[PDB]
Design a protein around this ligand. Structure first.
Ligand SMILES: CN(C)C(=O)c1c(N)ccc(-c2cnc3c(c2Cl)[C@@]2(CC[C@@H](O)C2)CN3)c1F
Ligand SMILES: CN(C)C(=O)c1c(N)ccc(-c2cnc3c(c2Cl)[C@@]2(CC[C@@H](O)C2)CN3)c1F
Lengths: 291, 285
């Protein structure tokens, strides 16, 4: 089955569907209003026909329902009704940061610092649970109408958890296989510090409206990262950003994962521990979006 | 598609004699050209992984890798024609004869390393070196076999790459796992170390421990590579060969070509006559 706690009932008995959200980038997502509280939620609808694979969807719900942290999108349960799965989540009324900067242009360094602190808080919590987001980017950082920051979309993370379970289920007899082969089969070949690198790239994304090498063919970018002399990217405009921001980029984009700072360590960095970082900075951004 | 497929009736060319392998390697027949003997593996045509397996065997041309002769397509059945190894696998052998002598193990290890060094310079990985996949012919000569696991891993690596998504936010270690899999050909060197213990003791180390427990242990970093059970039975050279092939760190594990310079497999007197002696034991015991 997909999850042992699924509500086997029509979601429309609890929510009035209001409008579609996200333009389809996140699937079929509906804005909905609770019929008793009046609170707003987002409902993602996924098809669940009898003989489809449920493993990835199962992993995604398992990840969502065991998170209870302010900087992670809240989970309110799922509804299975007539071969449709509705995932009920916290509604973030300003969309993703990508939705926002595609209108406003590049974020200020202080706005990027607040965002980075809030994501690091969410990442420290996930890493403390032995979870890995693995798809940190502007599109998966959501903003509510109060200017707060919420990590969302564990679909990639669920995809990898499902691979891990399958490859482990059919790994076969292990008495002859090398330790490093067993470790890739059980652990995946990397660890939660990949999230720290992705935040570094996301910080550049917010500063420059594209990740580095966005205009390079994706298979070429993958190949360049595997070469011995590969150089981590940097911010484009040196004089636009303080040395603190430049250093933040340098350390998050540490090439060797053995030397890359963890999320708790990054929270002590000058850029995200400076005073004056609060949701008002993003309300300013939302006001610019509005004006 | 394989451009060399023979689109004709294989029984128009071979007499099908007995089955072989007890079904462990699939449906494979001992065949006689209709005086040469071949092995014919048949598979029902429902297949990209089967494609990839044949390409591995077809492109390999080395005396220590089981030879490939061609494939016939007929009545939705694919007939893969290969070199026949009349003494079966080393597992078939030692289950009758008992543990191999150190000299016999040394010769088998040299022959397998020769095949591995060829494979690794072809940018291939066997990934299932074990007694069951090391075959012996009637001359006592050693041939690596069964690239099915190698084909499946290469297909999983290719497919998971085709659904990896945009890579601009990916860390370089994640990129490396996507393109290269997370390990390399030195895993075959470790598997050979285990195999040599298998040939000496009739079982790989930890054979009587639950497999999911053995997977749990191998990833703990406190993990200690196994050793030969009975010290006084084997020379210091054998023990050292086990030590170096079972190097935990893949960054320090010697390559196949380097291992060919090890004392155990470079000593004189290593030849097929040792396995002819073994093949005499299975006949006379
Ligand atoms: C008018 N607005 C704001 C939108 O159309 C809009 C938008 N452009 C972008 C993103 C969201 C949004 C808000 N909250 C969410 C979600 C999303 Cl996608 C999810 C996370 C991903 C998916 O699982 C559903 C859960 N909570 C939008 F509503
Ligand atoms: C009476 N004997 C000896 C056997 O039954 C016997 C046996 N017990 C074990 C192995 C073989 C054997 C010999 N030569 C082979 C093959 C195998 Cl399986 C393959 C290698 C890969 C596989 O796909 C087909 C091609 N060359 C046996 F014939």
């Amino acid at each position: 089955v997909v999850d042992p706690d699924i509500f086997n009932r029509d979601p429309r008995d609890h929510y009035d569907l209001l409008q579609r959200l996200g333009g389809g980038t996140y699937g079929e997502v509906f804005k909905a209003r609770d019929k008793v509280s009046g609170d707003l939620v987002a409902l993602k609808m996924v098809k669940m026909e009898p003989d489809d694979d449920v493993s990835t969807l199962q992993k995604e719900i398992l990840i969502l329902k065991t998170c209870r942290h302010a900087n992670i999108v809240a989970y309110h349960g799922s509804y299975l009704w007539l071969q449709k799965l509705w995932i009920c989540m916290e509604f973030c009324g300003a969309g993703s940061l990508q939705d926002i900067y595609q209108v406003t242009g590049s974020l200020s360094e202080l706005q990027i610092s607040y965002v980075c602190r809030e994501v690091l808080q969410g990442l420290a919590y996930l890493h403390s649970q032995k979870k890995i987001h693995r798809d940190i980017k502007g599109a998966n950082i959501l903003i509510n109408d109060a200017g707060e920051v919420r990590l969302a979309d564990f679909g990639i993370s669920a995809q990898i958890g499902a691979e891990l379970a399958r490859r482990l289920e059919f790994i076969g007899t292990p008495y002859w296989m090398a330790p490093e082969v067993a470790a890739v089969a059980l652990k995946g070949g990397y660890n939660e510090l990949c999230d720290i690198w992705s935040l570094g790239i996301t910080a550049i994304e917010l500063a420059e409206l594209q990740p580095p090498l966005f205009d390079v063919h994706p298979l070429r970018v993958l190949f360049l990262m595997t070469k011995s002399g590969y150089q981590p990217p940097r911010l484009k405009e040196k004089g636009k950003w303080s040395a603190a921001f430049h250093n933040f980029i340098k350390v998050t984009l540490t090439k060797s994962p053995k030397k890359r700072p963890s999320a708790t360590k990054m929270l002590s960095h000058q850029l995200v521990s400076q005073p004056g970082l609060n949701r008002g900075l993003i309300l300013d951004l939302l006001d610019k979006l509005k004006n």
